[model samples]
Target: GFMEEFFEQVEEIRAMIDKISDNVDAVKKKHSDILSMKEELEELMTDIKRTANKVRGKLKTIELNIEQEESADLRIRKTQYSTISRKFVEVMSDYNTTQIDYRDRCKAR
Candidate 1:
């Protein structure tokens, strides 16, 4: 399943970024709206928190299911869990990327 399955309401791409956008927005300010950029990052982080909550809850549930199964030698039970686990890792890394990407562009200007 694509990670979007975990990001239920991810539809705020058009926040009233009226003050600035991309290089234009960053360049608008001498200091690059340092705090304002944080505001947007925080919004995305909040969504990450929610996504982590739901995903971890379900992941633990899956772990319990796998634990109950008496098949350590089985395929896809525990191993498949790795798929979702790493996908969450992927989500986290994206956050890392988002921060640096935003930071780089912000500093770029």
Candidate 2:
């Protein structure tokens, strides 16, 4: 009788484990979209942080280049302004490249 009861308990536990396994698989499948969204968000945040750092570098370069300028005109016309402008634009381009809008643009084409 004890042997029979032991077998019954084993069968119950087996059924329980199988149910749990199926549930785990179902949950994984159901929340797959959430997992993908989390991954995308993480990538965006990383890119934004990288862009922020480049933006800082661009600022510093522009500041240094601007301080060395010698212009008598009120409009501040100088060759270095163009160079600083180009550098700032390049950094902004890099920032845009790491944006979601850039990704969408790529996807559209």
Candidate 3:
């Protein structure tokens, strides 16, 4: 059921992306007069989606072929998975902070 856990983690990441994208859209709409970052944000959101999709594919592939794996290889894979999973949270946290900062900018405008 480790694959299940991996899938769940990826799903959480997708949810974060959706929320971030939604907020970014709102910021563009409400602050477009002063915020000209819409096009750049659009591209970055697309990139995040692609990046997350790749991690999902990677985890699935590992699950599929892991039944015939080795010792160090397994350790490395788990380490990579853990590291990447942590990265999602790190990015999401930063996004939340960035949202607060942007909100402050709009508030004082």
Candidate 4:
């Protein structure tokens, strides 16, 4: 009777150990996934900064030339300005969306 009771207790302890191992494995996976997500967000932030700098350059060029340029050149500048503005808006939208996603991810953590 003593031997059987001891064996039963051992079995229960083993089961608990297995469950804890499973929980640890799941936690490791979550940690890895969160790091990956953070890296992805960093890349997106970098891209947004790069594009913002480029758009600023375009803005300065257009502004500088607008004052002294001829009509033909003005037309070309208008087109360029429109294109750059559209791209700026698009990047802004994407940046905003990414920020919202980042906030939600942090909350989940």
Best lDDT goes to which candidate? 3
TM-score of each: 0.49, 0.33, 0.42, 0.46
Clash totals in order: 2, 0, 0, 0
Query: lDDT per prediction?
Result: 0.47, 0.44, 0.56, 0.49
**Please, what are the lDDT tens digits per residue for candidate 4 over residues 5-107?**
4345434433433443343344334435675545654554554555455555646655565545535545655565566556556545544554445423656
lDDT tens digits, residue span 5-84, model 2: 43354344334334433433343343344534456555544544554455445446545644665224413323434544
For candidate 1, write residues 1-109 as lDDT tens digits: 4224322321211121211123232323423356355565455455555655665666776677566755334454466567656656665555555454553464534
Evaluated at residue 3, the lDDT of candidate 2 is 35
Worst 10 residues of 3 by lDDT: 27-36
Which lDDT tens digits does candidate 3 get at residues 1-109?
5555655665665565565556545544554455555566566556555655665565566555554553654665566556655665565565556545664465643
lDDT of 4 at 91: 47
After superposing candidate 4 on the true structure, give the runs of residues whose Cα lies further than 4 Å from its correct spot.
1-37, 101-109
lDDT of 3 at 70: 38
Candidate 2: pairs in clash: none
